[PDB]
Every structure is written in structure tokens, then in C-alpha cells.
Design a protein around this ligand. Structure first.
Ligand code: ACP
Ligand code: I3S
Ligand code: MG
Ligand code: MG
Length: 311
């Protein structure tokens, strides 16, 4: 039997994702011959599956994608417009995690300051909390965060947004990348533990963590400033999370399976933290068709996609 897989990615994503690339590649896996094509444009001939990350929620690619899906219903998308749309909403992601009993820090999708005030006044939302845009993917603004340390810190929040209780997690985050059942994981630095010293809020873009160098004195412990200032608070690789006693392989596989089932996604990245590095994983982010840690082997990627396709 033969299966055609078509990888549809712009050069920008091809460059960040792959060490190198190939046009024609054919291989056999589990008694099936896979023909894999990579292009920046949609296929002229209908394949069995299209493997794609939609660069932006709106625009030409998004439009082409929706049209193609409608007009070629037999083509499997990894991942579809519908999955990208859901994964572009922090509300929709967290609703599915909650519905599927996957621990997260306490989270509220809010539309207004009045709503935030009521959540604070009723002791539902506990300080400090991080404010994440409702839009989750495809822009610089999607990653523009505020940490609210005191009630007065709510004044300049951009709505709609997710307000999520801030967990002091000792500046370690576990990243689990999935190609279906195939996993890759790592630990990175994250954000420092924060202190409620009187400062009302601080801001950072997750793509520009050097913002943290400018936070007022007292929010971060002096020793944490010493330990992280040399790399400008950048997202730095740490030791393997099992070796660090943060998690186990079985825990990561269980969590990743639960998230994939909850969200109906095969190609994703899951970020989780633990309060004081102990207890339940707390999922803080799920991303469609992620970085996989950057610069991955092309042949590895396509074989694992083929494996996923069979399953
Ligand atoms: N509830 C929480 N408590 C403490 N820190 C949190 C947190 N939620 C997120 N963080 C920190 O903020 C960072 C950015 O949050 P998040 O991962 O949700 O945004 P994002 O979707 O912009 C990241 P990506 O670039 O991986 O998509 C995380 O990497 C983590 O360091
Ligand atoms: O895999 P991690 O380390 O979690 O980071 C990814 C983010 O999670 C994605 O949201 C990025 O996509 P966008 O820049 O389109 O939002 C994505 O950008 P990319 O698709 O260009 O690689 C990555 O930065
Ligand atoms: Mg993240
Ligand atoms: Mg994200």
C-alpha cells in the first residue's frame, strides 16, 4: 500500500524547524510505502494527508487552507483549520483541559475589568496572577504578558484575556513535544519566583524575556537576579526533567496522551510547571505544531509523522 504525505510549510517555518530539507523522499514503514513531498504551496495533486502549521490566524494561507479542506474532504490535515482555530484561543484550550480533568493553575477567561474585580472580591482569583492574551498564536501580541501582584495592578490589562494564578515553580518548565505517541521532552528556565513587595504589576513578552531585567527591585530575589542575569532571563535549556526529579517518563506520556485526546491534536507542545517543583504537573500552555526544540532532523520528523498517520 502507498500513502502520500504533503508537508505544506512556508520557508520561515522550514528554516526554524529543520536542520535541512528534502523534496522527494520515499520510505517504507510497517509494510506501507510513504511518499513525502515538501512545498511552500498547496499540492497540485491530492495527497492522503497534509502536514501543516498555519502561520497566522488570518490571511492568504488561512484562506487557502479553509478552501482546500472544504474542497478535498478526504485529505487528513495535521493540523486542520478547526484545530488551529481552537488552539489560537486560550479560553477554548483551557475549557477542554478543565473538561478533561487535566490540572492547570486556576484560570479564568475574562472580558472586562469589572469581571476581574468580581473574581478578586469573591476570592476566586488569588494574587499574584498572570494575564495572557485570549489570542494564543501567530502574533507578537499573543505573547505579551502581565503579572498582577496587587489589585491595583489590573488597571492597564488588555481584554479579552486569560487570568491564571501565578505559581512559584522555581524557574523550571517541562516542555513535552508530541508527534502523536512519539515524544521529545526537555527542561528550560521559565520565570523566576515572584515577591509581592508593593509593586503592583510587571510586564514581559515571552519572546523578549530580557524585559525581566527592567523589573523594579523587590519583585525578584537578589540571588535569582544574580543567577539569571547573565543570560538575560532567556529560555535556557536545563538538565533532563527526569534527571532533575521533576517528573518521570510515565508521567509525561500519560499527561501528553490525555492532552492529545482532550484537544484532538497530534502535533503539539505541552508546557507544564510544578509548584515548588513538587506535586501535580500544572499545564500552562499547549501549542499546535511547535518548535520541537528547534533544528530537527527532517528524516526523523517525516518518519514519526508517517507512524502517527498509521495510528
Ligand atoms: N500560571 C503560571 N504561573 C507561573 N508562570 C507561568 C504561568 N503561566 C505561564 N508562566 C510562564 O510564562 C511563560 C509564558 O506563558 P505561556 O507558555 O502560557 O505563553 P506562550 O503561549 O506565549 C509560550 P509559547 O511561546 O510556548 O507558545 C511560560 O513559559 C512560563 O515561564
Ligand atoms: O515550541 P515552543 O518552545 O513552545 O515555542 C513555539 C510557540 O509555542 C508557538 O506558539 C510559536 O508559534 P507562533 O509564533 O505562531 O505563536 C512557535 O513559533 P514557530 O512555529 O515559528 O517555531 C514557537 O516559538
Ligand atoms: Mg509557552
Ligand atoms: Mg503558547
Amino acid at each position: 500500500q502507498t500513502v502520500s504525505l504533503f508537508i505544506w510549510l512556508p520557508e520561515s517555518k522550514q528554516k526554524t524547524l529543520f536542520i535541512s530539507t528534502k523534496n522527494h523522499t520515499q520510505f517504507e514503514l510497517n509494510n506501507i510505502i510513504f511518499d513525502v513531498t515538501l512545498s511552500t504551496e498547496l499540492p497540485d495533486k491530492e495527497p492522503n494527508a497534509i502536514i501543516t502549521k498555519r502561520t497566522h490566524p488570518v490571511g492568504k494561507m488561512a484562506d487557502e487552507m479553509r478552501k482546500y479542506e472544504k474542497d478535498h474532504p478526504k485529505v487528513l490535515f495535521l493540523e486542520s483549520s478547526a484545530i488551529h482555530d481552537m488552539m489560537s484561543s486560550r479560553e477554548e484550550i483551557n475549557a477542554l483541559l478543565i473538561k478533561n480533568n487535566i490540572p492547570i493553575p486556576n484560570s479564568f477567561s475574562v472580558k472586562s475589568k469589572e469581571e476581574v474585580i468580581q473574581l478578586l472580591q469573591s476570592k476566586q482569583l488569588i494574587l499574584p496572577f498572570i494575564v495572557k492574551p485570549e489570542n494564543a498564536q501567530g502574533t507578537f501580541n499573543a505573547h505579551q504578558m502581565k503579572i498582577v501582584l496587587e489589585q491595583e495592578g489590573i488597571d492597564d490589562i488588555h481584554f479579552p484575556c486569560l487570568c491564571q494564578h501565578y505559581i512559584n515553580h522555581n524557574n523550571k518548565i517541562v516542555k513535552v513535544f508530541c508527534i502523536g505517541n512519539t515524544l521529545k521532552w526537555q527542561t528550560r528556565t521559565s520565570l523566576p519566583n515572584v515577591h509581592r513587595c508593593g509593586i503592583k504589576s510587571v510586564d514581559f513578552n515571552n519572546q523578549h524575556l530580557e524585559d525581566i531585567l527592567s523589573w523594579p527591585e523587590g519583585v525578584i530575589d537578589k540571588q535569582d537576579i544574580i543567577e539569571n542575569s547573565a543570560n538575560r532571563f532567556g529560555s535556557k535549556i536545563l538538565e533532563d526533567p527526569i534527571l532533575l526529579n521533576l517528573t518521570s517518563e510515565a508521567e509525561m506520556r500519560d499527561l501528553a496522551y490525555k492532552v492529545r485526546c482532550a484537544l484532538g491534536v497530534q502535533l503539539c507542545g505541552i508546557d507544564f510547571i510544578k509548584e515548588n517543583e513538587q506535586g501535580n504537573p500544572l499545564v500552562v500552555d499547549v501549542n499546535v505544531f511547535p518548535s520541537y526544540g528547534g533544528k530537527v532532523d527532517f528524516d526523523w520528523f517525516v518518519e514519526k509523522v508517517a507512524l502517527c498517520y498509521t495510528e
